[PDB]
Amino acid sequence: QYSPNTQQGRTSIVHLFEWRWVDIALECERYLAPKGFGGVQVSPPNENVAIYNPFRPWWERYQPVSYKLCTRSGNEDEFRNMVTRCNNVGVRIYVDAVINHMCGNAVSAGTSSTCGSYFNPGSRDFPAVPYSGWDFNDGKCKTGSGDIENYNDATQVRDCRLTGLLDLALEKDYVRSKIAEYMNHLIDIGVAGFRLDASKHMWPGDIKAILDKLHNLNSNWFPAGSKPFIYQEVIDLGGEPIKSSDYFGNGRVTEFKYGAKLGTVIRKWNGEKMSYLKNWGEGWGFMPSDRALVFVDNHDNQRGHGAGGASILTFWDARLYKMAVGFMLAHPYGFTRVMSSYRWPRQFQNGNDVNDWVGPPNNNGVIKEVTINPDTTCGNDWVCEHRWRQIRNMVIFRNVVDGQPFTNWYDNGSNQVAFGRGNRGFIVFNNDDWSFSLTLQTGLPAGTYCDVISGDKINGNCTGIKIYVSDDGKAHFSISNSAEDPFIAIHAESKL
Numbered sequence: 001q002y003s004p005n006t007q008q009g010r011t012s013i014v015h016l017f018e019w020r021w022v023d024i025a026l027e028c029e030r031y032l033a034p035k036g037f038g039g040v041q042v043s044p045p046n047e048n049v050a051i052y053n054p055f056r057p058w059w060e061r062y063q064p065v066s067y068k069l070c071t072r073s074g075n076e077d078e079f080r081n082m083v084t085r086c087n088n089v090g091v092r093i094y095v096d097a098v099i100n101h102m103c104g105n106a107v108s109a110g111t112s113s114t115c116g117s118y119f120n121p122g123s124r125d126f127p128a129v130p131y132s133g134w135d136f137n138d139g140k141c142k143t144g145s146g147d148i149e150n151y152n153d154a155t156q157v158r159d160c161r162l163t164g165l166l167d168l169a170l171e172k173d174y175v176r177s178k179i180a181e182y183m184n185h186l187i188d189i190g191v192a193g194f195r196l197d198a199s200k201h202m203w204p205g206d207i208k209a210i211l212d213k214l215h216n217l218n219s220n221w222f223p224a225g226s227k228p229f230i231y232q233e234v235i236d237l238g239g240e241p242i243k244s245s246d247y248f249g250n251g252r253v254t255e256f257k258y259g260a261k262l263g264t265v266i267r268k269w270n271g272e273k274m275s276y277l278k279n280w281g282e283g284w285g286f287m288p289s290d291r292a293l294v295f296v297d298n299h300d301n302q303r304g305h306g307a308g309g310a311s312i313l314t315f316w317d318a319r320l321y322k323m324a325v326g327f328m329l330a331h332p333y334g335f336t337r338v339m340s341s342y343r344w345p346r347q348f349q350n351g352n353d354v355n356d357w358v359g360p361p362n363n364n365g366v367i368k369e370v371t372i373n374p375d376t377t378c379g380n381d382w383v384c385e386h387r388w389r390q391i392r393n394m395v396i397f398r399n400v401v402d403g404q405p406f407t408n409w410y411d412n413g414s415n416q417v418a419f420g421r422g423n424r425g426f427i428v429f430n431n432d433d434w435s436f437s438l439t440l441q442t443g444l445p446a447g448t449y450c451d452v453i454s455g456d457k458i459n460g461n462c463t464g465i466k467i468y469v470s471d472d473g474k475a476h477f478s479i480s481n482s483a484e485d486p487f488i489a490i491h492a493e494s495k496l
């Protein structure tokens with residue numbers, strides 16, 4: 001469960017949040033494969049409640065109605081077409097598996113669902129699965145409300161309703177089997193793995209019992225005996241009885257400490273400085289690198305959901321965001337996930353975004369196509385961070401340097417830092433309020449290298465900055481604190 005099953009030489013996943021299957025299929029072929037992306041995390045592909053108040057929020061996709069592959073991203077034929085086309089160009093698909101719960105217990109009964117299936121939350125009736133009242137934890141939960149009330153009580157966190165979401169009885173073989181049926185359907189289509197939603201809200205052994213029922217990956221694309229990559233969403237910032245390590249038997253685990261701390265460092269909040277990143281990783285109290293799924297922001301915390309956190313960096317803070325993503329992609333710790341977002345009309349009243357619920361760009365609830373502009377950015381209010389040059393080129397940096405040791409660290413005692421990855425790449429950051437002008441040991445072979453932050457290598461030349469590495473491996477770097485992108489990155493495949 002720990003191997004990502006990406007092609008060799010591809011080292012990151014991109015979350016194409018709320019994208020349609022037909023758009024992802026095209027993206028695989030026209031962009032993700034030639035740019036060396038390892039795979040795509042997709043939004044939940046199973047039927048969910050169509051919530052009309054507020055109007056079609058993103059979070060309706062976390063309220064299942066059935067396991068039919070029928071959503072605003074598309075139908076089963078489109079989903080299958082996408083997985084096939086992506087695998088055929090070497091780009092994997094990872095499914096957001098929403099298996100802890102069905103929908104909210106206060107949702108009205110009817111057919112307000114993305115495939116029109118009938119469901120009745122009050123009576124616990126989900127006949128398109130089917131599930132009945134026997135399949136929920138209503139009798140097992142011990143709180144007075146039936147909901148989770150106290151995170152200091154690990155039992156209620158698992159057995160009670162998260163914010164009223166009907167909690168599936170994952171200790172029952174019937175329920176485990178219906179979930180496995182769904183996940184095996186997806187495996188056989190060709191999915192390479194799963195993001196397991198709300199993993200803290202499930203017992204590790206119930207997750208295990210489900211995974212035990214799963215097939216090996218599709219043997220047309222994956223070697224015999226390949227297992228789905230599993231990465232579990234567990235928010236563990238410390239101080240709770242449930243720990244991310246409790247889930248290591250099932251797969252990797254999201255390291256939410258990563259983006260929380262990195263955001264505070266890059267914002268220069270709380271006395272933090274980039275020079276302290278010299279021991280980034282386990283030295284900062286993070287889980288083992290071979291289990292961490294790392295990221296700057298995710299779909300919840302870029303809008304204050306989940307654990308939130310004011311320090312989280314997002315596309316709204318583009319300059320600092322690019323720096324944080326760049327540091328993450330250059331540093332060997334963890335398996336990296338890049339976010340790809342849509343814009344929404346963020347509006348703060350008191351201190352909260354009252355539009356944090358807004359769903360993807362849409363016309364009367366129909367998700368808009370991802371249109372591609374001539375400069376390779378996206379239209380229709382899709383942000384497409386994964387197409388920003390500075391991020392796309394850092395995805396390739398990570399591939400080029402894969403396996404190479406962290407080395408040649410420099411810092412000025414403040415926020416001017418640099419480091420290399422063996423003899424294959426070097427990166428330099430200036431987050432201080434003055435210019436960084438210095439000759440540094442890069443560890444690289446002598447030559448002229450294109451800076452992949454400011455430009456690209458093409459036709460034996462560079463479209464941005466050029467760095468000149470001498471025979472002794474030293475090169476001069478000058479980065480103004482006024483730079484739009486105050487970091488420079490060079491690697492073996494950007495050498496002229």
Ligand SMILES: OC[C@H]1O[C@H](O[C@H]2[C@H](O)[C@@H](O)[C@@H](O)O[C@@H]2CO)[C@H](O)[C@@H](O)[C@@H]1O
Binds near residue numbers: 053054055
């Ligand atoms: O503007 C806040 C809130 O107003 C409406 O919510 C109402 C709902 O319509 C009523 O049927 C009842 O349930 O009380 C709700 C507010 O407590 C909107 O439906 C909702 O989207 C909006 O957030």
Ligand SMILES: OC[C@H]1O[C@H](O[C@H]2[C@H](O)[C@@H](O)[C@@H](O)O[C@@H]2CO)[C@H](O)[C@@H](O)[C@@H]1O
Binds near residue numbers: 059063103106164300
């Ligand atoms: O109706 C149940 C429940 O749904 C919404 O909760 C969202 C939550 O906002 C998201 O962060 C994510 O976890 O998915 C949840 C389920 O859709 C409402 O926000 C919540 O108040 C409501 O009780």
Ligand SMILES: OC[C@H]1O[C@H](O[C@H]2[C@H](O)[C@@H](O)[C@@H](O)O[C@@H]2CO)[C@H](O)[C@@H](O)[C@@H]1O
Binds near residue numbers: 200233306
């Ligand atoms: O809301 C912050 C508070 O609750 C969190 O619960 C999360 C849930 O655990 C996650 O699976 C996420 O996807 O949505 C929920 C948000 O309600 C955190 O578990 C908790 O540590 C935090 O204090």
Ligand SMILES: OC[C@H]1O[C@H](O[C@H]2[C@H](O)[C@@H](O)[C@@H](O)O[C@@H]2CO)[C@H](O)[C@@H](O)[C@@H]1O
Binds near residue numbers: 271279284
């Ligand atoms: O080491 C992890 C730790 O780094 C920073 O804390 C210390 C650092 O360990 C020391 O080398 C010292 O010189 O500076 C820092 C204290 O100012 C981070 O501040 C800390 O958050 C992090 O866990």
Ligand SMILES: OC[C@H]1O[C@@H](O)[C@H](O)[C@@H](O)[C@@H]1O
Binds near residue numbers: 170171203204205206
């Ligand atoms: O390990 C899985 C088990 O953990 C427990 O102790 C729960 O009470 C049970 O419902 C669950 O099946």
Ligand SMILES: [Ca+2]
Binds near residue numbers: 157160
């Ligand atoms: Ca549960």
Ligand SMILES: [Cl-]
Binds near residue numbers: 195233254298
């Ligand atoms: Cl996540």
